[PDB]
Each structure stands twice: as structure tokens, then as C-alpha cells.
Design a protein around this ligand. Structure first.
Ligand code: NDP
Ligand code: TOP
Length: 276
């Protein structure tokens, strides 16, 4: 449905020039602000350049100012990154990005309901967040050794729970495969229901409503602060422990698309630029 694919990456000599393009599908580039990011080898993703919805404002990161220029062709539904005077430090995977909404209310809800609790998440969700959640014991499930010694890495559901210790509540924070496993064990669901019709590749497991009793619920219209209407909800299991799940669900239980939340943004595949 919605898809971005970059091209133009190449091996290029220092001082040379390159032009990246990002072909968009499923939406018009001139309706949203488009952004370029890049991730140098074994480094964290950084923002490179962006262009506003109307095409009037172009912003650049310090290290590329005067060398890169972003532009777009409304007809070809494509964004471009002209890169000149390439430096070896420009070496990275370059990623196209579209900003289709924001929902800070859900992130405030998430923070408020997880601070001072341990959080369990799968490896893909760790990658989607990209950073430890401060003020929380982070527990990541993965069959493979960890890659970040700031968080606790575990190899099984039972170890994840044991890693939490004796706490009154454990928060399972995603993603789809992890939710499936912890749903049968959960006493409580914190849900954000988002009024967004999006396809994704990750879903919240179907929970049966008669299994669950709503103890809190609160609908908020969309406005200039949250671009989709949303409804917070807290459910308790009829006939239950300390395990809670917290998740934000768009229509039909979609929770994710390529390690991002599709009510807010979509990412491209990335194109490799090597300056050497
Ligand atoms: N809207 C929302 O509320 C949320 C949305 N999301 C979205 O969900 C998507 C990711 O969900 P998903 O793709 O399901 O991946 P998950 O985040 O559930 O993590 C999957 C990985 O976790 C590890 N894992 C899971 N169970 C076990 C186990 N029993 N023992 C060992 N390792 C285990 C494996 O890692 P390995 O392969 O290393 O063994 C597995 O591949 C992303 O798009 C993200 O944006 C994420 C969080 C919340
Ligand atoms: C703190 O930032 C993120 C948090 C989450 C997890 C999460 C986010 N919102 C809700 N309601 N439940 C969750 N389990 C997921 C994210 O990406 C999928 C985040 O980055 C945007």
C-alpha cells in the first residue's frame, strides 16, 4: 500500500558527486514533509535533510550544509538528494522517510504507564526504538547474543519474567511476536485505539472481548496536537498475576510496518553510499 524505495547509492571517490532518489508509492510527496536520514556503519541513524509539506522550507544538518540539496518532483512522486563534494564521513546507508502524522499523546501515555516498571520487548522492537528506555529495566528477548550492554538480554519467556524480579507489575511493550506469547499470561491490557486506516506487517493478537473487562476508557478527537483521534483503554482479565501488555492499535489491530508506526511515518529500504 505505502512504500518508499531509494536508489542512486554507489561507490564514489572523495570530492565526487551523487544524486539519490526516493520513489514513493501510495501517497503524494507534495502533501507531506519528506526527510532524508543516514546511518553510517555501526553508528546510530542521524537526520540529514528535510523538506516541508508545501515545498517552501528546506532544512539541513550542520555537517552537510552547503553540500547537499533536497528537492522533489511532484509529477514523478520522487524526492531527490543531490550530494556534492562527498567526504568519507558521508559514507552511510541513506534512508528516505515520510512524516504522515504525530501522536505524542500515545507516547506520554506509554511513558506514564511504564516509568519505574520493568519492560519486556522483542528484538525487533528494541531495533524500532533504537535506544534504552531510561528509568526502566529494559529486558530484550532474543535467541542470539545481545548487542548493547545497557539493557538485559534474555533467551526465553521464563527468563524475561525472572529478570523482572519481585515487582508488582511487568510491562510487555511489544512487538507482535512477543505480544502473542504474553497475552495468555496477562492480567491487564493498556491499549491505545487509533482511528487510522493503515496496512502493516505486524498485528496485535486477536483478544476475545468477553475475556476482558474495561476499567478505563477515554476518547480524544484529532486536533493540531494529535493528527488522529485516539482512545485510551485499560482492560482486566475476567478470571486471572503481574503481567500487563501495553500497545497502540490502529484499525484491525495493526501495530507496525517495517519497524515503525504507520500512523506517524514510513521508511524506505535504504541505499548504500560509499565514499572511498
Ligand atoms: N504500536 C505499538 O504499540 C507497537 C508497535 N511495534 C511494532 O511491532 C513491530 C515488531 O514486532 P515483531 O516484528 O513481532 O518483533 P518483536 O518485537 O516481537 O521481537 C521479535 C523478536 O524477539 C525475539 N523473541 C521473541 N520471542 C522470543 C523467545 N520466546 N525467545 C527468544 N527470543 C524471542 C526474537 O528475536 P531473535 O530473532 O534475535 O531471536 C524475535 O525475532 C515493529 O514494527 C514495531 O514498530 C512495537 C512495539 C509496540
Ligand atoms: C517510546 O517510543 C516508542 C515506544 C513504543 C512502544 C509502545 C508505544 N506506545 C504504546 N501505546 N505502547 C507501546 N508498547 C514503540 C515505538 O516504536 C514502535 C516507540 O518509538 C516511536
Amino acid at each position: 500500500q505505502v512504500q518508499l524505495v531509494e536508489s542512486g547509492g554507489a561507490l564514489v571517490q572523495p570530492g565526487g558527486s551523487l544524486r539519490l532518489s526516493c520513489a514513493a508509492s501510495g501517497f503524494p510527496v507534495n502533501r507531506y514533509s519528506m526527510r532524508w536520514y543516514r546511518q553510517a556503519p555501526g553508528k546510530e541513524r542521524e537526520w540529514v535533510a528535510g523538506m516541508s509539506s508545501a515545498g517552501d522550507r528546506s532544512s539541513y544538518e550542520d555537517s552537510v550544509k552547503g553540500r547537499f540539496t533536497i528537492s522533489r518532483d511532484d509529477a514523478r512522486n520522487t524526492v531527490y538528494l543531490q550530494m556534492n563534494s562527498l567526504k568519507p564521513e558521508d559514507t552511510a546507508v541513506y534512508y528516505c522517510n515520510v512524516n504522515v502524522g504525530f501522536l505524542p499523546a500515545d507516547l506520554a501515555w506509554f511513558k506514564r504507564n511504564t516509568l519505574n516498571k520493568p519492560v519486556i520487548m522483542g528484538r525487533h522492537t528494541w531495533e524500532s526504538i533504537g535506544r534504552p528506555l531510561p528509568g526502566r529495566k529494559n529486558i530484550i528477548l532474543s535467541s542470539q547474543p545481545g548487542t548493547d550492554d545497557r539493557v538485559t538480554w534474555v533467551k526465553s519467556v521464563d527468563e524475561a519474567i525472572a529478570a523482572c524480579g519481585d515487582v508488582p507489575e511487568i510491562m510487555v511493550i511489544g512487538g507482535g511476536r512477543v505480544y502473542e506469547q504474553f497475552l495468555p499470561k496477562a492480567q491487564k491490557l493498556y491499549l491505545t485505539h487509533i482511528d487510522a486506516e493503515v496496512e502493516g506487517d505486524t498485528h496485535f493478537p486477536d483478544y476475545e472481548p468477553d475475556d476482558w473487562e474495561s476499567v478505563f476508557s477515554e476518547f480524544h478527537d484529532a486536533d493540531a496536537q494529535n493528527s488522529h483521534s485516539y482512545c485510551f483503554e485499560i482492560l482486566e482479565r475476567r478470571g486471572g498475576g503481574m503481567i500487563s501488555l501495553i500497545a497502540a492499535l490502529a484499525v484491525d489491530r495493526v501495530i507496525g510496518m517495517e519497524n515503525a508506526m504507520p500512523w506517524n511515518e514510513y521508511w524506505g529500504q535504504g541505499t548504500q553510499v560509499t565514499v572511498s
